Design a protein around this nucleic acid. Structure first.
Lengths: 124, 63, 145, 209
RNA sequence: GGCAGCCAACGUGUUGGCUGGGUAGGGGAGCGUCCUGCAUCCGGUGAAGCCGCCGAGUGAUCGAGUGGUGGAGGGUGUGG
RNA sequence: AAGUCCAAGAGUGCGGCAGUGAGACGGCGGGGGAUAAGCUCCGUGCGUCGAGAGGGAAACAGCCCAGAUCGCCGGCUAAG
RNA sequence: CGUAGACGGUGAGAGCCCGGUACGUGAAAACCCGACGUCUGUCUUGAUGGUGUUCCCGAGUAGCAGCGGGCCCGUGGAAUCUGCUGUGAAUCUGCCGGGACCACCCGGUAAGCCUGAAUACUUCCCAGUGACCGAUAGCGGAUUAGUACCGUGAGGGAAUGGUGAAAAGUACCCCGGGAGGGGAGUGAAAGAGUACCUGAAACCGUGCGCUUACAAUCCGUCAGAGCCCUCGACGUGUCGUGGGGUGAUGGCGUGCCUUUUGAAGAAUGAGCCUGCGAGUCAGGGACAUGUCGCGAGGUUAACCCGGGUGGGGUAGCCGCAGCGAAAGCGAGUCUGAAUAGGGCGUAUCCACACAAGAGUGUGUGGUGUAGUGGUGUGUUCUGGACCCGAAGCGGAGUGA
C-alpha cells in the first residue's frame, strides 16, 4: 500500500497560502515562509484581540477626558461623580455621548459634579 | 525466535508458589570468621527481591 | 440477517496503533524518547545496570542441584476425588484422567486435603499417609500400583 | 424444531429436514463472527508485497564521497533511504497474514451464521439442483428464482453433484461451497443458503458427531 | 455568551460545582491519505486531479454547495 | 480536633508507559574565593524561569503583580 | 446464452462485436512415462529340520598416550565421535557402548561397501496469483541498460513512458532566410500540433485596481481614513446585520527548527517549489492491558484430507500443590536430637467458638478458587530494529 503524500499534503499548503494572501514577498508565496508568518500572524491576532478591549477603552478614556475638560471637570473626578450618582454608563457610551451629543455629556458632567463630595480631598 | 532466559538470573532467583521472586543474601561465601553468627543467620536463607529490582529480575527470568 | 457489512469488532476490542514521530500534536519529533542519550537511539539491555555489579552477578547463585532423576508426581487430592466421584467406585489413573484431575500420561499421587465421604477403590502410584487414611476411613481401598 | 422443507426442482416438497438447535439456533455472536471472518480474509490475503531495503537495492556499497571537506551532507551510500533510487526503510516484506483462530471459535461463528439464516428463514434445502446428468444453468437459475429472490446465494452442494455445481456455477451472485468447507464468510456473504439434502445431512452428521 | 475535562443530583441528558498555561512525557479521542471485504450511491447529462467562488467545523480539516479546466473513474457507510 | 471535602483532582500500595538524572537566577542560611564574580558547592512544603503567555521593571528567562479554555468596541482592580 | 457472468480488446462500464472462456477435441515427427514379447541373468546341478568337536567371523585396525577439532559440554571427573603423531591388541571365556570400573546386567556380532521415498533450490521454460510497485515507485534497467558516462583496472553506473478513437500529424494563403506564427483545414476537443493526457508549485511576464519617492518596516497583527469593486435597500445617492481588494496613519510586535540555564540571537540547519525521506516486520517469543472463545480446563505443533477460508491431528504447552538440596514428604513441607519458633505454601471471604491483647492466632463450619487459546494495543527480546553519518577493520581481487 504505497501512498503518495500529495492529496493530503497540499491541503494545509493551500490553507496557509490562502490565509497568507496579502503578505509581502516570500511570506505570501512560499508555504514554509508563509507558515512562519502565519504562526506569528495568529499569535498577534490573539494578543491584539485581547489588547483591543484595552486599547479601545484607552481611546474612550481619552475622549471622555477631552469632553470632561471641555465641561471643566477632570476625568477621574468625572468617573468618581458618575459612580457616586450611580450612573452606570460605560466608557464606550460615555465617549459616544462626548462626540455625538455634547449636551448629554454636559448633563452627565453636571450630575457627576453634583454627586462629588463637597471636598474630594477630605478623608471621608 | 524464542526469548532466551538470562542464565545468571535463572540461577540466582526463584519463584514461590504465589509467585514471589526470592534470592539468597550476599556476604555468606567466604571471610566468615569475623562475621558474628547473628549476621550469618540474618544472611542465611531466602528473601523476596526488593520491589525496585522485582521488575528487572522478572524480565530477566521471563525473557 | 447479519452480513459482512454488519460484522464489527467488540466494543474496545480494537485500538488505534500509535503513530509515533508524526507531527508535534501526537508523539512528535523525539517519538517519546526524549533528548539525547543512549536511549534516544538504542534500547539499553535489561541486564545492564550502569556498570556496577548487576543484581544477577552480585547475588549468590541459589544453592542446590536439580537432580536429573527426580521422580515427580501429578497430584490429586481426596477432596477432588469426592467432587469428581460422588458415587465412589473404582478410581484408577484412567478414571482420574477422564475426570480431568491429573495429566493423561503421568505418575499419579493422591493427597488428603479435602474430605472423603464415599467408598473409593483408588489406585495411584503413591498415596500420602492422610490420603490412604481417608480412603480407608471412607470404607474404600487404596491400592498402590 | 426448524423444519426446512426439501423442495425438488420440479416444484414439489419432498420431505423436510430438522435443523438441530445446537447448529441452527445458536445466539449469533457478532464479535466472534467478525474475528473469524477477518481471520479468514487475512488467510486469503497473500502477503506477496516486497520492497528492497538499502542493503537489497543494487550498488551503493561505496561511500559516495569523502566524509569531510566537500561541503555536502555525510552520505554512506548512494542507496541510503533519503536518496532517490535508494532503499525503502520500513517498506512491505512478504507476510503470512493467516491467523490461528481456535477451532471452537471457527465452528461457533459458522453455527451462528447458519443460525441467523435459519432464523430469518434464509436456509433452503433441495433434493437436486437441476435434474441430474447434463448441467443446465437456465434450469438452475429458474429453480433458484422460485426458491429465493435475493442476490447472493451460497449453494452448499456435495462434491459428487458435479451436475448441480456446473449448472449453478455461472450465476452471478451464487457462490458454491461443499458441506465440509462451509465457512462463516461464505454464509454471511450469501443472502440465502441452499443445501442439497445430502449436503445438509452431511453437515448435520459431521457436526452432531 | 460559547466549548471541554472531572465529579455529584435527578433523569433516561439536563442542570449544577469545580476545573481546563504548559516543554520531556503519559493517557484519550479524532482529521486526512490509498488499498481493500461487504453494502450502497455518483459518473462522457462529465469521475478524479487542479484553479477559484460562496461558505462550514472547537481542531487536523470540510464541502453528495457551486463555477472554470479536465477527460474516467469516484463518494458514503461499515469493517480489515 | 477541625478545616479543605459536587476537591486537593491529595496520601499509600501494586502494575503498563515514561521523561529526567547539564539546571539558571532571586530571597534567606552557609562553605570555597578577597566573607570578588552574572563565580563555585550546599540547605531552603522558598519563589520564578526551565516548561509561563498577560501587565510593570525602557528594552531586559529568573525581579514585582499575575498563572492565558474561547469571544465582547463592558466594569473593578494588582504591581506600577 | 450460460458446463461460457475468467480476463482482456473494441472510439466510454460488452456473458451475447473480437481474441477468448466453460466444455470439447488434435499429433506425422521427436522426447518422456508405461506396460507387452524377444533378451538377461540366476534357482532349479535340490529342499528338510537336530549332535558334538578344531579353524572363521574384515589389522597397522580397535585400544593407549601427546597435541587438537567437535559435540549442552570453553579440558573439565569428560564418556561417545573424530585429525596428526607415536605405541599397538585378541576373533567369541573375543570386542564394543550404556558419559571410568564390576559377581555384573542389557544392547549386539565394528575396523570394506552400494541403497529409492520422505528432503534442499530454481539459471531456464510453462500456466497463473497479488487488500504488491505504477515511471524520483517497482529490477540498476518500462526508453540505449549494465547501455551512455566515469575509471588504467577491478569496478562504479545513470537519465529518458502518456497527441488523438483513428495521423485524420496543418496538399494550395500570408509574415519570416529559418524558427515560429496568423489564416484556412482535420478533429468531439488543437483549452490534444509529433515541443503534444491532466498541467500543481517554485520561477518569469503582461494588463487592470489600490498604494507608495520626509521614510528607520521579524515585513505581521489590531484599529483604520481614503480609494476601487460587489450584494441588498430605498428607487434622490446614501445606508446596511453587508462582502471583497488596497492600506494614509496610530498601537503592539525580537523569524522557524535544533540544542540549551538561557537564542531574535552575531550558536546549528534551511536559497525556493514539487516529489521522495525515519519506531517497521517475523516469531504458539516475554510482560502488562483491551477484547472475544471455551472454561477446571484451555489449546493443539508438525502433519493428513479439502482448487479457499474448512475438517481432522491428545505429541506437546500452560492450568491443575506446595515445601525442600532428596531418601523425599505433601496441605503441608524445610530448618533443626529438641511436637522449640521461623521460611514458603495452603485463592479469597463469612460465621462459630477457643484462646492472647505481642500487633492477632487456632482449629471447626460455609461459598469454592480460573486458567487457557486467538486477537488489538503499549513496552520488550533476537534480528539493520526509528532513519542518516564515521574514521577505520577483515576477505578476495585491480593497479608500476
Amino acid at each position: 500500500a504505497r501512498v503518495k503524500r500529495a492529496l493530503n499534503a497540499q491541503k494545509k499548503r493551500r490553507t496557509v497560502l490562502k490565509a497568507s494572501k496579502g503578505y509581502r514577498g516570500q511570506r505570501s508565496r512560499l508555504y514554509r515562509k508563509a507558515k512562519e508568518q502565519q504562526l506569528h500572524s495568529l499569535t498577534y491576532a490573539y494578543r491584539d484581540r485581547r489588547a483591543r478591549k484595552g486599547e479601545f477603552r484607552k481611546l474612550w478614556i481619552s475622549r471622555i477626558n477631552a469632553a470632561a475638560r471641555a465641561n471643566d471637570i477632570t476625568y477621574n473626578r468625572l468617573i468618581q461623580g458618575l459612580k457616586a450618582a450611580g450612573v452606570e454608563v460605560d466608557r464606550k457610551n460615555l465617549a459616544e455621548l462626548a462626540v455625538s451629543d455634547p449636551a448629554a455629556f454636559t448633563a452627565l458632567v453636571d450630575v457627576a459634579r453634583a454627586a462629588l463630595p463637597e471636598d474630594v480631598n477630605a478623608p471621608s | 525466535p524464542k526469548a532466551k532466559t538470562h542464565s545468571g538470573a535463572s540461577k540466582r532467583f526463584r519463584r514461590t508458589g504465589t509467585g514471589k521472586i526470592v534470592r539468597q543474601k550476599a556476604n555468606r561465601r567466604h571471610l566468615l570468621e569475623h562475621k558474628p553468627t547473628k549476621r550469618t543467620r540474618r544472611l542465611d536463607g531466602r528473601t523476596t527481591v526488593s520491589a525496585a529490582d522485582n521488575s528487572r529480575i522478572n524480565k530477566l527470568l521471563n525473557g | 440477517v447479519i452480513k459482512l457489512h454488519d460484522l464489527k469488532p467488540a466494543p474496545g476490542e480494537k485500538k488505534a496503533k500509535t503513530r509515533v514521530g508524526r507531527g508535534e500534536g501526537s508523539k512528535g519529533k523525539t517519538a517519546g524518547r526524549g533528548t539525547k542519550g543512549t536511549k534516544a537511539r538504542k534500547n539499553v539491555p535489561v541486564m545492564f545496570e550502569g556498570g556496577q555489579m548487576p543484581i544477577h552477578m552480585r547475588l549468590p547463585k541459589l544453592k542446590g542441584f536439580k537432580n536429573r532423576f527426580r521422580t515427580e508426581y501429578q497430584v490429586v487430592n481426596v477432596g477432588d476425588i469426592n467432587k469428581a466421584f460422588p458415587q465412589g467406585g473404582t478410581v484408577g489413573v484412567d478414571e482420574l484422567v477422564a475426570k480431568g484431575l491429573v495429566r493423561k500420561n503421568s505418575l499419579v499421587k493422591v493427597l488428603g486435603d479435602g474430605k472423603l465421604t464415599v467408598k473409593v477403590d483408588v489406585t495411584a502410584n503413591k498415596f500420602s499417609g492422610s490420603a490412604r487414611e481417608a480412603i480407608t476411613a471412607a470404607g474404600g481401598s487404596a491400592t498402590e500400583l | 424444531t426448524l423444519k426446512v422443507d426439501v423442495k425438488t426442482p420440479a416444484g414439489k416438497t419432498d420431505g423436510s429436514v430438522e435443523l438441530p438447535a445446537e447448529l441452527f439456533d445458536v445466539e449469533p455472536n457478532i464479535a466472534l463472527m467478525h474475528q473469524v471472518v477477518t481471520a479468514q480474509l487475512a488467510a486469503k490475503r497473500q502477503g506477496t508485497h516486497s520492497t528492497k531495503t538499502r542493503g537489497e537495492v543494487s550498488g551503493g556499497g561505496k561511500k559516495p564521497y569523502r566524509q569531510k571537506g566537500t561541503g555536502r551532507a555525510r552520505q554512506g551510500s548512494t542507496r541510503a533511504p533519503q536518496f532517490t533510487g535508494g532503499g525503502t526503510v520500513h517498506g512491505p516484506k512478504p507476510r503470512d497474514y493467516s491467523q490461528r483462530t481456535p477451532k471452537k471459535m471457527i465452528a461457533a461463528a459458522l453455527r451462528g451464521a447458519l443460525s441467523d439464516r435459519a432464523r430469518n428463514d434464509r436456509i433452503h434445502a433441495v433434493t437436486e439442483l437441476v435434474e441430474g446428468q447434463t448441467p443446465s444453468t437456465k434450469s438452475a437459475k429458474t429453480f433458484l428464482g422460485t426458491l429465493t429472490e435475493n442476490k447472493k446465494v451460497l449453494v452448499v452442494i456435495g462434491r459428487t453433484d458435479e451436475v448441480g455445481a456446473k449448472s449453478v456455477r455461472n450465476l452471478p451472485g451464487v457462490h458454491v461451497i461443499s458441506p465440509d468447507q462451509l465457512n462463516t464468510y461464505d454464509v454471511l456473504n450469501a443472502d440465502d443458503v441452499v443445501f442439497s439434502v445430502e449436503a445438509l445431512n452431511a453437515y448435520i452428521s459431521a457436526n452432531s458427531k
